Design a protein around this ligand. Structure first.
Ligand code: HEC
Ligand code: HEC
Lengths: 135, 135
């Protein structure tokens, strides 16, 4: 159990990306998402994720509906947030990362953190984090 | 002359929006843009822009190329930033706003601030700012 990452909305914006129909991740994470990182984790991003994220890092995957209206992509309603929280001693079986998810009402969502980490093991080279900070 | 808003990338993310071909603003601002606001201006956004932004507010319109690859919208190279800086006494003829623009190399771009403000007068009711903070 991790408390809702209150205030993540004001953290540093790392990158954005829209997953469109047909994308292999559309069914789970389809829509427009923004990634945010708290102060503790930001420097590791800025240096290119060549060292592990420190304990206390929190990263939030903010997933929104993608609305297409009048030659524009608009932010629709929030779908969910995904959260990764670094604590090597607390999460030894998922690479030191605590995987969590919350709905738009801020209530926890039932997830399988082992399944989150299974895919994120593809990014083991950069401490299990896919996104790169976009200047 | 306004100095480049160094560090805006770490300010609060207000909203995002993609302008697609055919949009009336595509030729000038086509692509994926993110809006950021410095601490001074953030509270006015959070309260719904019912009062004027305070002196010292800086808002940045960060415009990126929109890349469509493999059922995804990806952030492409930066195109430009637009900047609005609140100083009622400094900019009396543009509603207290200083309009500025910078290229990807951080160098000023030659703009007509009166033309920026002419369109933003459409948002005079919310102190000449169109965007709303998206929770
Ligand atoms: C592959 C099948 C994945 C599964 C299962 C999970 N995630 Fe993931 N995640 C995936 C990708 C390709 C990305 C990068 C997105 C981008 O814009 O580049 C992410 C990102 C995240 C993040 C941001 C940090 C990062 O790794 O870049 C978080 C905080 C995150 N995802 C959380 C998360 C959770 C909680 C999951 C289980 C419910 C989960 N992910 C599964 C791919 C995949
Ligand atoms: C109409 C023809 C416009 C002209 C001319 C200029 N801008 Fe503008 N701007 C316009 C819209 C519709 C928006 C909202 C975008 C959104 O995502 O909702 C904006 C936004 C900005 C912002 C962000 C603050 C805000 O008003 O929401 C900035 C800092 C900004 N624009 C700068 C700017 C500059 C420097 C311009 C002249 C070079 C300029 N704008 C012209 C519409 C129009």
């Amino acid at each position: 159990g991790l408390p809702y990452p209150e205030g993540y909305r004001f953290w540093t914006h790392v990158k954005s990306m829209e997953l469109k129909p047909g994308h292999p991740l559309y069914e789970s994470f389809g829509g427009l998402h923004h990634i945010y990182v708290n102060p503790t984790g930001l420097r590791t991003y800025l240096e290119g994720k060549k060292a592990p994220f420190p304990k206390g890092t929190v990263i939030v995957f903010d997933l929104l509906e993608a609305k297409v209206e009048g030659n524009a992509l608009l932010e629709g309603p929030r779908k969910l947030i995904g959260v990764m929280a670094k604590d090597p001693g607390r999460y030894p079986d998922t690479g030191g990362w605590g995987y969590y998810a919350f709905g738009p009402d801020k209530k926890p969502l039932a997830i399988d953190p082992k399944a989150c980490h299974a895919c994120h093991q593809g990014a083991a080279n950069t401490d299990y984090v896919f996104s790169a900070f976009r200047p």
